[PDB]
Subunit: 38 residues, 4 copies
């Protein structure tokens, strides 16, 4: 079972990056979605 | 059929997103690399 | 009305980046979502 | 309550995503900057 030790700090930073990226994309969609469609 | 105008607000928000992505990727990749690399040749 | 000229190539690259980033995040969610929840 | 193990597959896919993000941001930011900057001092 291949697995990787990490501290809570590193896992938190990974989680935060994914969350913030999604939030950013959703923010952009709120501007550009209606242009992609018309 | 080949050229577009983009509104200022949309361009501003895109540039801000890309800048923030970049700052985030750079930090995250550096800390992942340094934490997982536990033995390094001097 | 402040606006910015660009060619189809540049707009396509912007669109592709946003689409590919979303796809990547959705891909990661298909692995990590059940860990975030339990 | 302070340390974790991450499975190999999840780590692999995260690293791949970050690498791909980075390659994409670098390219996109460079072409945006160069296209919008239309006058440059020699
Ligand atoms: Ca719009
Ligand atoms: Ca407009
Ligand atoms: Ca370490
Ligand atoms: Ca999982
Ligand atoms: Ca496991
Ligand atoms: Ca130009």
């Amino acid at each position: 079972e291949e697995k990787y030790y990490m501290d809570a700090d590193l896992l938190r930073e990974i989680k935060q990056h994914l969350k913030q990226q999604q939030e950013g994309l959703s923010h952009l969609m709120s501007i550009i979605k209606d242009d992609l469609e018309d």
